[PDB]
Amino acid sequence: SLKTDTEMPYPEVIVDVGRVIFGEENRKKMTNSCLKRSENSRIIRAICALLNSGGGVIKAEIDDKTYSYQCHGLGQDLETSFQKLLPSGSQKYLDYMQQGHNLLIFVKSWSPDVFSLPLRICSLRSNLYRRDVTSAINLSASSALELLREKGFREEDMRILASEFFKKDKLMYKEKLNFTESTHVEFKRFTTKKVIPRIKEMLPHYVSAFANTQGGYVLIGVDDKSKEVVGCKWEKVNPDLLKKEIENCIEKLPTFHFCCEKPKVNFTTKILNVYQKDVLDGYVCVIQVEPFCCVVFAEAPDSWIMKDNSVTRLTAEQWVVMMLDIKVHKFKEALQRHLFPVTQEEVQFKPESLCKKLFSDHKELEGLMKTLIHPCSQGIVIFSRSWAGDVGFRKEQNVLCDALLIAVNSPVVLYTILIDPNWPGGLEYARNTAHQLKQKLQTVGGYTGKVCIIPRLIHLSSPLRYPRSYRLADEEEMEDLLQALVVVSLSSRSLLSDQMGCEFFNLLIMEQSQLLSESLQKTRELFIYCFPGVRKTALAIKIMEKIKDLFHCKPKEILYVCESDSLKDFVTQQTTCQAVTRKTFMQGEFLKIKHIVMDETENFCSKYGNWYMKAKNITHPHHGILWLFLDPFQIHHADVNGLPPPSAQFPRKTITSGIHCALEIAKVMKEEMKRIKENPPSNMSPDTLALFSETAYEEATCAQALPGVCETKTNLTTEQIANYVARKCHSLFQCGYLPKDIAILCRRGEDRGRYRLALLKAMELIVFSPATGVWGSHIVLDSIQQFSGLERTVVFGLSPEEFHKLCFASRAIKHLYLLY
Amino acid sequence: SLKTDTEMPYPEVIVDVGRVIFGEENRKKMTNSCLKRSENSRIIRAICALLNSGGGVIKAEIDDKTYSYQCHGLGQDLETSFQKLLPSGSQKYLDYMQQGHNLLIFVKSWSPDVFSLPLRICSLRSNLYRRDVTSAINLSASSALELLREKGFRIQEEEDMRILASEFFKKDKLMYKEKLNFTESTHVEFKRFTTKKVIPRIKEMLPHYVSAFANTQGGYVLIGVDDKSKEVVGCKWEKVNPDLLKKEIENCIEKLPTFHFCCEKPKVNFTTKILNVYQKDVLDGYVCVIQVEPFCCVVFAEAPDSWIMKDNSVTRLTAEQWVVMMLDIKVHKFKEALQRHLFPVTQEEVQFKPESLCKKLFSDHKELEGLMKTLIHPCSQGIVIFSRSWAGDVGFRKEQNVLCDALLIAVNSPVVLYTILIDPNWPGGLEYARNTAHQLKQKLQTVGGYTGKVCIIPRLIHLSSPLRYPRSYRLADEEEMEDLLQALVVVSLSSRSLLSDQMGCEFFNLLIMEQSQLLSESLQKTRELFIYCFPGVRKTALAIKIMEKIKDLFHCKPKEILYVCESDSLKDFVTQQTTCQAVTRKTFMQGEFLKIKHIVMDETENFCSKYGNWYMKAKNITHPHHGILWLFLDPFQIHHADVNGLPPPSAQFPRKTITSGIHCALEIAKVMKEEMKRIKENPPSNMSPDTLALFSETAYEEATCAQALPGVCETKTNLTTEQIANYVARKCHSLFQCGYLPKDIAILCRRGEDRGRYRLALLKAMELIVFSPATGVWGSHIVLDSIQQFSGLERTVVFGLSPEEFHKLCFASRAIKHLYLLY
RNA sequence: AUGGG
RNA sequence: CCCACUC
Ligand SMILES: [Mg+2]
Ligand SMILES: [Mg+2]
Ligand SMILES: [Mg+2]
Ligand SMILES: [Zn+2]
Ligand SMILES: [Zn+2]
């Protein structure tokens, strides 16, 4: 994407302007001021394009060989242009430096802060004119923006007797117009040197001024102080040609429309005949412009962007479009504080897993970095298998890894370690990676400061300079940059993205539980309904903690009752409250129990007693809590519950938000829900499949989900499937994932052992644990029935060649591989 | 409060600027620039003060006696100053008219729209500076505001210029014409001495560079250096004394105003030293260095160039005041509906509102209708709004010499305030009317939020029977009149009057509708609910709307919906509107309701289990199918001395508290809150302590501030029966004069045995100048009954007569706007 | 012929 | 000198 530019390989868009004279004394002295104006304009449009296109560097060549910036300054008209381009301070966006015979102007990206008008893009001139009293004022960016917002939500005696001059036809010589110019009246006189091109150049800024503000009459052929009518000789210009010229000129004036009818600008052009002693003398031309509905331009706006490495001018429609233009930003401070703290205790390498893998694979890398970063009292280094891939651009096999250094009083450095020293693509790779990383930090993270990324290449067995303003001055800039990094990684998919998404979901669960806990004081018996992918177990744990906090009771007096033993073990590892299985709850003695929470009441079996009646008798000796969590889409046991009929299941809620899966997993869940609703099954009643809405599910999905991967393969063999699993596992472990991330689940339990053996061979070509091993550092290989209520970040679903996709997707967070 | 101004009695603040020359050519051809600048400046300060202080009219005397505005124009320098004061449009705020030898400038009130930045006031020049590259730019109003919010929100390069310049102070000895190797940048500025005057020009120039230094990055300023040569020439021995030193500038720089978002309040720091110049190792002169460190907050070169009106004088704004006024409800949501249902902008005829006050006026005076009809004629559209005193409506003055006021609003016409006088011999009417118009206009802007140009022209009419404004001050289309009437609705909803009372009642109707819409969600989430209601929540309307929702959500006839209450009067009230059965609890028992599907029960607190179990009966009816058993409870309004059949409060789930819904006045709500606090401090016996814990004062504060409206609550004590009757008769007569109706008044006696007596004692006092029982609310009569029989119903005006205590809550609950507690 | 640097 | 309205 970037050019070659071997002389200065800056990781930015570089605009070369040519040869420019510099120096205050030098600039004050020229002949041929056209060259001076052109040299000012070129740099100004370059600055405008760079402000509107994400920043960059401007390259100029110095004519004076003995020139020195510290002794000659910069100029005087250039500073005036800078003031007229950046009214609220030009220092925050421009810097100047001198590399020998080169003058470099560093331009920051234009982004308004939280204390400013919402002015999205920078312009020299709005080029849409307004009328104040009698002068046509070219509006500024802010004034034009206010006018656009005005039209989006959609003294006088001079206007009289102007239409009277419009009405009459015959004129003698030297009529003293009794009315002077006003908002609706303005006049000029002809120029005998050139008439038609002067009218070309002069009409637009009055036609636009009238069309914008009320409506007016342009009179041409009238003097200022004498207030008479003069005109030019008839032989100089034919009136019909002039009228046609005026019509075609007005038709070419750019226009924007907030309405739908798209009317053209309505004007009336008339020619008169100024006589002299009953002899034809000349013409006076009158143009009446009514108040137009929407904004009328005189020329294209003085705004520029960068397209195809060229400084181009924005059109009217484009200019108006970009002129008028999440929970990540709410929790980014906490995420940065917990994941990327800014301390003074040496330098910390992140993430721990990938760094451990890289340092175990190569011992010299740790010392090589600890010597390269030195001298640095404090800082942060973030590693990645491919920072280009993490951003989402490219993946190079010749690169071992990339590191990012962020520290105070220092710029940001991008280290690129190469497996092979003589590979000729390292420098371009590092430069482009720095460019795309900075661009993503700006356009996504929201970093409005000044920062630079320096590419550096490094070999296993083994200089650009910026303005000092482009270095992280203090710790606050470090925090802002790291929060932008948090946003950028949460927007992408990688190992760090997965870990930070887990932290994000943990933060969101607390808010959801706090909101849910308000119903504790409003209800005693409740029937909570949960969508596919809600994580009812974490909600239940937080609810038990809140019950213990609100009702001042011993944790032993709160009973969690579930169906599966693995979920019970997970829960007793989590909460101090008592947790029993359904079979233990029955044929059991519970006399000192006040509050009961039931999860997985879907699969409760009534073939051993009435569990609902037992719970009601326990909570109704005092009136205790009897909250039931139900997800009617996850019924596996072929038995009815002790549940009362759906009409008697009141009061109830419908937890819609709580989707802590990837976007594609949520898509699969939504499609499966639609399929189930279209063709209801036997064990799911129509009444219960009516409280879940697809629109609400989509709204909850595009408020908490994060990017991930779902991939389905069909018509595969056992050995091929095992090899696929082994290869994907190997790639993940290389990228930094842990064994306690992955879980392989087979639909049929009897297919476990076989699928185990083919696994042990596959990983041999390139240790599995039961369902009570999800907290250990091993890959879990079990069945869907035995894995109910648990979850892991990467899930491999094995099933022979069908509404059970949802049971697989409910067990996964970011990666779901469905192999048939 | 306005001045006399017999010549032009505008209802505006008029600023007389003096004897001023006008003309596009008359100002050009004129010497004595000290006069041109003075007149331009005076007019500009007047415009700025008017813009920042509500608008008005500037009056000037034109120099040329042949001057005509349409011929001679306004000028060029004045127009440029107008452009520099209002960057985005001046026609929106300034109009000009000529009356004889007077030029009047009509100045609108600067009010930022929903588009522009929050620039609250207009500024000619902020006078706080910035650095840029090598410059000192006076910040515009917008950029200055940006800087204030930013500051309160708390091989060679350019930076090399600081080096080789920070070491200039260390150069204690200096030799004549030494070259300087650094050029001007963001950290250095040097100026050349002036031979004629040295001190005054230094003092003029220092503040506006010290401001930029202290406001952008710091730095230092030299004096004695040339721009074209970088000399060290400086002054001489005989023209500069050692008096000009650090101490001398220690007062000039300290004269600069400084604001501070900080608490340390540090004065600006500067150090001055003298570098001697040596022409051939001989002293020749001195050059000056002043080092200015950057400031934590803003530093002002001068006082800001902003003006307001104080004591009818154009008064300059200091830095603190300027920065303070630069950085500084559901009525606006419902005003569109209120205006379209109360003031429909149509063309069928002229609408005289309010109707009750108009009826009283037209019955007290038969000829008022014809005089009014002739006053606006010829006309086709508009609304005429009548009042007993429009000055008193906006809360300023009540006059016994004025019969009534009329406000005419029409398309292609300005607002006209008519003042009707009983006796023309009264001389002071004119001023009154004028002032009133002024006040009304201001209320339409500060309170009503109106932005466009409007003028209120006062006229004086007698029973036994010209100000000029710009054309732009007349209403243009129907949308303009709609916005003006919406502003009027907003203004009146914050005042106390008849029109305010009716608007508040309809406001309460809309609020109740939205509250019931919110409450209808719980019909999808539960079957039996225990709704706990604050005092003054108007639960009966909620119940009516709830059955309206049940009839649709469950597609069933109104027959299978039941209302259960305690009083027969409220049963009739409810059965008046609702199509469902509405029977009291006594007849609900000893009866059979087999077709009933859903039951809504009101006044559940005073239900008595002396005839069985009503709760079990309702439960068994609703539990044959699972029906709805919503129960509304008000624990603070227990009257009956009976034990309910309700389940214990620990078994009254699921439950919800309707905290919001306060549809009374601010003072009535305050009385309610005080009674709540008194009750909670000393709990009674008929209410369980557990139930007196679901109610918090803060939520009541929020609801009252969000929904209540200003009203009247007066308590009189130590009175006899005749005095109370006289008070009631006088208040009723005065209210009927104001335009009220008997259907808004309820006189309630605590003890029922006091009723008959309080009838006769009343009827005498009223006869000095027909009643209804509590079951007469729907009739057009004044009800005189007890609060026990009026429980559950409401009236706008309540007279609570009580013998000489926790029962003020009932009286406050039956009242909407006016409460008069007589003991 | 009008203001800001 | 630079810039803005301006015949
Ligand atoms: Mg003009
Ligand atoms: Mg002209
Ligand atoms: Mg300078
Ligand atoms: Zn349009
Ligand atoms: Zn401070």
Numbering used by the authors:
A (entry chain A): 3 to 156, 180 to 350, 381 to 517, 526 to 684, 695 to 839, 848 to 882, 888 to 906
B (entry chain B): 3 to 156, 177 to 350, 381 to 517, 526 to 684, 695 to 839, 848 to 882, 888 to 906
Passage from the reporting paper:
We combined all three datasets for subsequent image processing to reveal two prominent asymmetric SLFN14 reconstructions, state 1 and state 2, at a resolution of 2.73 Å and 3.11 Å, respectively. The quality of the state 2 reconstruction was insufficient for model building, however, state 1 revealed well-resolved density for the NTD, MD, and CTD of an SLFN14 homodimer. We observed additional density for Mg2+ metal ions within the catalytic C-lobes and Zn2+ metal ions within the conserved zinc fingers. The SLFN14 homodimer is supported through two intermolecular contacts, an NTD-NTD′ dimerization interface and a CTD-CTD′ dimerization interface. A 3′-overhang duplexed RNA molecule was modeled into the asymmetric RNA cleft. The unassigned density lacks nucleobase features and was modeled using RNA of arbitrary sequence. Each SLFN14 protomer interacts with the duplexed region of the RNA molecule forming compact RNA binding surfaces of ∽400 Å2 along each N-lobe. Highly conserved K213 (protomer A) is positioned next to two magnesium ions within the SLFN14 catalytic site and is sufficiently close to interact with the phosphate group of the terminal RNA nucleotide (N7), an interaction reminiscent to the conserved configuration of a scissile phosphate. Encoded within the C-lobe, the cluster of disease mutants K218E, K219E/N, V220D, and R223W are poised above the catalytic Mg2+ metal ion site. Conversely, the SLFN14 dimerization interface is hydrophobic, acting as a strong molecular glue for a constitutive homodimer and presumably priming the enzyme for RNA cleavage.
The SLFN14 endoribonuclease is a post-transcriptional regulator that targets the ribosome and its associated RNA substrates for codon-bias translational repression. SLFN14 nuclease activity is linked to antiviral defense and platelet function. SLFN members are multidomain proteins comprising an N-terminal domain (NTD) often associated with RNA cleavage, a middle domain (MD), and, for select members, a C-terminal domain (CTD). Here, we reconstitute active full-length human SLFN14 and report a high-resolution cryoEM reconstruction of the SLFN14•RNA complex.
